Amino acid sequence: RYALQAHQDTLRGMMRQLEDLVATDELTGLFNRRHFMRMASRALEDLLPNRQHGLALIDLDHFKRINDRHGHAAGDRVLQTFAAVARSCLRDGDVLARYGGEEFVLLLPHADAEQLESCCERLRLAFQQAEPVGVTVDTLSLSVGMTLLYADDDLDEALQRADQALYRAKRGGRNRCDATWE
Amino acid sequence: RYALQAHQDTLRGMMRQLEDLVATDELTGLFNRRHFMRMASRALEDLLPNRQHGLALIDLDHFKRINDRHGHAAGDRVLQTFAAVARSCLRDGDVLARYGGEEFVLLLPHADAEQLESCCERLRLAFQQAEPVGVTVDTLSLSVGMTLLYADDDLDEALQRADQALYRAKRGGRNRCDATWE
Amino acid sequence: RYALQAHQDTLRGMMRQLEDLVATDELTGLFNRRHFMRMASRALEDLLPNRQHGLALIDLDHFKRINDRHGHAAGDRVLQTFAAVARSCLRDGDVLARYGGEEFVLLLPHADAEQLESCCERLRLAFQQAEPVGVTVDTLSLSVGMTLLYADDDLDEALQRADQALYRAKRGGRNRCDATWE
Amino acid sequence: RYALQAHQDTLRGMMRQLEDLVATDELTGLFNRRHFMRMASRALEDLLPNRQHGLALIDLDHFKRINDRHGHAAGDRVLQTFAAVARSCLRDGDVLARYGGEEFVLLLPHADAEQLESCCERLRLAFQQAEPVGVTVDTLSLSVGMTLLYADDDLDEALQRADQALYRAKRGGRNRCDATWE
Amino acid sequence: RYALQAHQDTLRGMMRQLEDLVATDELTGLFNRRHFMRMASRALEDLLPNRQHGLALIDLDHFKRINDRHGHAAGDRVLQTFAAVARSCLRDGDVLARYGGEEFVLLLPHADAEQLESCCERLRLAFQQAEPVGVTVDTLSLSVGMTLLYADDDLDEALQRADQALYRAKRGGRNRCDATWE
């Protein structure tokens, strides 16, 4: 019995492992939230002292609104459109992942606060001119919350400040790129 | 993208295989419903022509009441009580399994309708006699619905027939055993 | 005894999952038939209404003869030749796979009947031009049979239709491309 | 490529492992040939010097003959009958396995050549009085080839001499227990 | 990538899991120390308030001296004997694990101080009376330190209690059983 329970606890734990190999969201072909969590930790510890990484939270403006008028299948093709447009804007080695139903998250290896600032505009503007095929959408905009990733940073804290920057960008009228501590 | 969805689908297929290894219900120490379903299927097929298996559905009486008066922990004890009791009654090589919240299911290889009825009464009276440690019980009874698994049966159908007999045994005033096609 | 057969059956289910991870054909470096079947199924389902995929069946001409004159090792080279060539022609994101001893199969996401016919000729002429290292070839050609995967198609049926076109292209005197429903 | 091949060679090797966990023949519920091979090695090395094990090859006399007259389903129920009868004759900790379509093999921990000799008669005679249910069989007999398992023995050699004893028992009229080096 | 980092940590996660499946000491056939640790967290948790388990630490007496006088293998044989013997003495469902080189550990489910003491005595004597074979050994004995595993208890603390109790019994002359909180 106790033997069976220990045994089955082992198997469940294997299942958990298997579930970590499922590292990507099929819809958008980006990495999922949990795999990002695990990747970013790994990245933060590799950082030399006095070095930084780029980190941004990306939210699609009025996404929930698109679902009602255009139905759900449309709103998903919007999400796939962001993935496509982002894949095209981003350089190799940069980390993009799907952070929530409506949100994405970014990490840029060894990136300056100006490099940071630059990429987010490029992305954001590219979503404005974005043309999701087979869906006739009136408006397309995203807002960004940025910050940086210093050595000995705490991730839950690091994510809180980019979100702050993002929420402030959401009140700033949307289609806004806002930063925290540069 | 399709290779990814295919690959992660395999991943999930492996998770399900592992699931099928988690074959027992930890509270009782009995095989779970899913594992019973898989066993019974292969006992149905391995049936020689014009031969049979016994198959009863056991339900504990007023069990929900016990949970209400004595709390969910006593409910659990009662089930470990039944599990303990049943193992004293059954011959080595019988199949007994948890089937629902308070339902169990039995399968007796090559057992006459007489043999089955004999087994179930002995089980039924054994339960009635038992006392669970650390829980004072108004009293304990169970009902059973019985039937025979024939070669070329449908297992879902066979099962439907014992549930019919279990329904009548409940209706008859509980603590009894009814049958269908013997 | 049934628990054993159930348990070992799971075991064999795991062996088959692992099988589905062995997704490529080592000689060519292309995806194998089984993996193609699993990919195409999910490309069929992911098809929006009134949209299509291209789908051709490629067969190399007089291949068996090459094995007879030049020996089974040259036969293999010719296939690595075709595999190399094809990868030069195809856009990133096409699906190409080994389908038989000498048969290959192609799938072009969102590709017009025009687009498909254009791709296949370019492939066809590219093969004709090629020379495999260390093997002197009388000459090289391939035939192809093409069709369109529609939403609500049957994949077996779709496939049956390209094999019909491939049959005619062989009949037409080889080194050509026939189609069915465009 | 080479990377893919190394990778897929890894997976095939896992499959091989999985295949070693499938350690038992379902029909007779005994261990299969390969698991016996692996078990006996393990047992031979554990042996103290000047210590022995029992080893016997068991063949059912005229088994192929039963298949013709009584059809295959009968001959299998004979095999299951031997497994049953053997399970009953044998003590706990003794190793019985299915060695071939018609043959079985035995190992007895720390067994004397007289203990050896004794068990094989008990088994053999018990198969004479054996009554395979649902099959009307005229005759039931097996022959045995025995030997022993000394320290630093070679298994392929150890199995050759018990077979010799067995083949000699097959010519000795069948229903014969013959030994090699006691 | 850092992705790569993550994916290999997962595989490493898996090996550890697979390691937890190797649950038993190969020399004796008992559960090993790690598997016991996990089985015993799980009993400690499943413990009703005002109820408890039996815990004992069993150390064989003058084992080191046995190795010197009779040789490493003879020592190993003595270990076997203790397992054999204990298997005889133990009610079904008692947990016996190898805890170290010459020390064991026993959990008794729902056992009384009085019940624990009776078991260790029956065990202490039985081992005294034993004769391993090979191996003639002049005399054997063990000493036992006991305690009770209550709810809200620390399992490592529980073991400290048992350890200390085992020390007093070694100090008190061996072939005895001391205890702590009974």
Add this chain to the structure above:
Amino acid sequence: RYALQAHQDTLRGMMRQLEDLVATDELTGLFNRRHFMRMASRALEDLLPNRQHGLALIDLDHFKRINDRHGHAAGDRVLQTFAAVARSCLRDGDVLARYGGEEFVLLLPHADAEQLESCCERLRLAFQQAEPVGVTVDTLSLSVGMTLLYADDDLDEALQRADQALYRAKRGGRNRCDATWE
């Protein structure tokens, strides 16, 4: 049982397998030494008669001294730089593995003596010109020992050739490439 012995050896078999999936050096992102060994048996086998592969052993120059003067992390950074650099220089489909603490190994598929030498020179110079970032480092260089991997060759012998050639280049003054049978 001995059965138990067998079953845990199988699990042990599995861990080893899982270990072969950890194929890449986490610091550099290159294949590790074991994965290379396996990739290279497989190329050696797939080699047509009178045909061959390129083999080189790359050792960074005065690495130990770098660690002492700039610190362990700086050394580690230099290793990264070499990977980055080599990735740029290498045709797609070249095999580069980390072979040791400061040494690499390169297989070139179907490469000429002349082709190998050209690659190592382009590599030797490129690394000379490089600037890791962090990290200011006064100067970098490596030395290269080369040979050809023929059919019917021993891969360990091939490596001996390369090793020796690497020694002559260290001895000859470093920042060079010696060779053995070209």
